Each structure stands twice: as structure tokens, then as C-alpha cells.
């Protein structure tokens, strides 16, 4: 399963911030305007439409991806094995992998 480990968006206060297509996996990024971002003091950017917000998010392997993960395969035929015991004759023992 993914983790949308969002990089923290840019907020330019008066005017645009063009985004670029960074090479992160599934790097989704879209500029946005028309904000007034309440951050701990009410808003902080003094404009009202030129307030720009650039959101960016890419996909990343979960921490569970290392450990809890499905796993595909192209499977061919290979070669079968066995730990054949023979308690032979009077030998009475061999437990060998063949």
C-alpha cells in the first residue's frame, strides 16, 4: 500500500508559483490560487486572491512495504526435491535430500 507522504505545500502570498513535474513517483502537483490561509494568527498572507498555494504530493512505499507486501512472480517449472528416507535393508538409515 502506498503512503501519500505529502511534501509540505508552498504558499506564496501575492502572486503565482508555477509548479514543475518533479521526478518523484506519481508526482502529483497542482498550483492553486484564491486562498487566505488561516495559520495560527488568522490568515497571514495579506493579499486575498493573489494568495497562492501550490500543493504537491507523490507516492512512496510504506514502511510496511519492506515487510508486509505482496509479491508477484513469473513462475516457470524448475526442479522438484525430497528428503527421501530409506531405512534400507540392514543399513536401516539414510535421510537424504535428492
Amino acid at each position: 500500500k502506498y503512503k501519500t507522504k505529502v511534501p509540505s505545500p508552498v504558499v506564496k502570498c501575492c502572486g503565482a508559483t508555477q509548479c514543475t513535474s518533479k521526478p518523484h513517483p506519481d508526482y502529483q502537483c497542482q498550483v492553486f490560487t484564491g486562498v487566505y490561509p488561516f495559520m495560527w494568527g488568522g490568515a497571514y498572507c495579506f493579499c486575498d486572491t493573489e494568495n497562492t498555494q501550490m500543493s504537491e504530493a507523490y507516492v512512496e512505499r510504506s514502511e510496511e512495504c519492506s515487510i508486509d507486501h505482496a509479491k508477484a512472480y513469473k513462475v516457470h517449472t524448475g526442479t522438484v526435491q525430497a528428503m527421501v528416507n530409506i531405512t534400507y535393508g540392514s543399513v536401516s538409515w539414510r535421510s537424504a535430500d535428492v
Binding site: 500500500k1 509540505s8 505545500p9 508552498v10 490561509p37 488561516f38 495559520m39 514502511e63 519492506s66
Partner: protein
């Protein structure tokens, strides 16, 4: 407890915008991001934007440092409450991050008690706890077979992954922008870097001690900013970028998912 000053010394208790902070969207220091109800053992690993653990300086994981003001408050953990549909059980905290044994719940709802105020934070997240096995319980029993579940650790001595933790961007603080009896008056925390100008034409960058403002007068048309990048942060989605640079601060995760046999 003195082996992860990577985070402790260098990271601060971040503050972000909690979504349904009791009433509505506040800005809680314990703003919940990255809820992970992805294990099996009744457990969720959570990140607060608050960095509890040791104090500001050096002692006792079981103390409690969130942000009040621009400032920390590194004090006791006395009355933490993670909860969901029912009250959860804490497992352990380290850094920004807490592990807690929860039941299933449509949401996740976190909060301590500073003492004067409840001051909680709450969030949506689909939670379940299937145990590993062909039995679809709702809860772990006392007995039964052990078999390979997925689960998070109790511990901190942990490096199996690390998340980027570079600087904070600025933050608003209009407590700064006082009035110089006719002009709007900015100040500084400790000599920190205050990034300043107003809609009118006056000082245009702001890298200063306490300035005044020749031109504008209204507090509501000025740049109350705090470039205070002496301590890095978690790279929350509810962070404004520090526009200058990708500073250093690669920092581990404690609560790795491990192959415990529940």
C-alpha cells in the same frame, strides 16, 4: 533513552491545523497526520505535530513538549488521551510519534490535558483490527495460537526507516505586531529572523531586531513572520515550505512495523 538526539535536540514540537479540534479547525500542536491502522495487534502508530519525549534539553521520555505560542512547553505527560470509538491504550511515545493500542473506529481522536484546558485534536481515519488468522475477531484474546502478525515495536532504538525532517517555514505571530503609539510595531523572539513589510511601502525584507513601521499603521496589513529555523520539523502537509532550501535533518522512525508473533 539518549541515543536519538538526532530528533530530540534538533526537532521541535510542530504546530499544524487540526481538522475538527473540539469545535472546528483549530491549530493544535498535536495536529494528527499519518494515522496508520495498518497493523493487526490493536495498535496504531500516530504522528502528532507535537514532539513529546525528552524535554527541550535532555531528560525523561515520559515528559511532554508541545508548542504554546511560538514557544515549547516541555512539561509532564500527565493526562494523555488517544481515543477512537473507545478510549485507546497508549503503548509508547518517541519523538513526534506515539504508538497506542486502539480498537476499531471510524475516526481517530487524540488529546492530552495541559491542566487549564482539554486541548485535544481529532481526525478521520478508517481503522480496523483483523488479527492474522482465518478468524475474524474484533479484538485480541488472552489465549490461542501464536502466528506471524504485523505490529509495531515498543522501543526507540530504531533505524529501519527514516523520514525527511527539514526546516520549518515561517509562521504567523501577530502578537509581534504591536503599535508604536501611532505606527505598527514588530518585535522579535530572541533575535530571531522576522520577515516584514506591509501593503504600503516600507521595509521590504525584514531580517532584523525589533523594527517599527514608518508607512502603514494597521496590524492587519503587515507581515508578522518568524523565520526561526534553529530546530527542524516534520514535513507535514500542514506545514508551509521553508522557501530557502532543503535543509538537512534526515530523522529516523521509532515504530517500525515488525514481524511480531501476536
Amino acid at each position: 533513552l539518549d541515543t536519538h538526539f538526532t530528533q530530540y535536540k534538533l526537532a521541535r514540537p510542530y504546530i499544524a491545523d487540526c481538522p475538527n479540534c473540539g469545535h472546528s479547525r483549530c491549530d493544535s500542536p498535536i495536529a494528527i497526520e499519518e494515522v496508520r491502522g495498518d497493523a493487526h495487534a490493536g495498535v496504531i502508530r500516530i504522528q502528532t505535530s507535537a514532539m513529546f519525549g525528552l524535554k527541550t534539553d535532555g531528560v525523561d521520555l515520559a515528559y511532554m513538549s508541545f508548542m504554546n505560542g511560538k514557544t515549547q512547553k516541555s512539561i509532564k505527560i500527565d493526562n494523555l488521551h488517544v481515543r477512537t470509538s473507545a478510549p485507546c491504550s497508549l503503548v509508547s511515545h518517541h519523538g513526534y510519534y506515539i504508538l497506542a493500542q486502539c480498537p476499531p473506529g471510524d475516526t481517530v481522536t487524540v488529546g492530552f490535558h495541559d491542566g487549564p484546558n482539554r486541548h485535544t485534536c481529532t481526525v478521520a481515519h478508517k481503522v480496523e483490527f483483523r488479527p492474522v488468522g482465518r478468524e475474524k475477531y474484533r479484538h485480541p484474546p488472552e489465549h490461542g495460537v501464536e502466528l506471524p502478525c504485523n505490529r509495531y515495536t515498543h522501543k526507540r532504538a530504531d533505524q529501519g526507516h527514516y523520514v525527511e525532517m527539514h526546516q520549518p517555514g515561517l509562521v504567523a505571530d501577530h502578537s509581534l505586531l504591536s503599535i508604536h503609539s501611532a505606527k505598527v510595531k514588530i518585535t522579535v523572539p530572541s533575535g530571531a529572523q522576522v520577515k516584514y513589510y506591509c501593503k504600503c511601502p516600507d521595509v521590504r525584507e525584514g531580517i532584523t531586531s525589533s523594527d517599527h513601521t514608518t508607512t502603514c499603521t494597521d496590524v492587519k496589513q503587515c507581515r508578522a513572520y518568524l523565520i526561526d529555523n534553529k530546530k527542524w520539523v516534520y514535513n507535514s502537509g500542514r506545514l508551509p515550505r521553508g522557501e530557502g532550501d532543503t535543509f538537512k535533518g534526515k530523522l529516523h522512525v521509532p515504530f517500525v512495523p515488525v514481524k511480531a508473533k501476536c
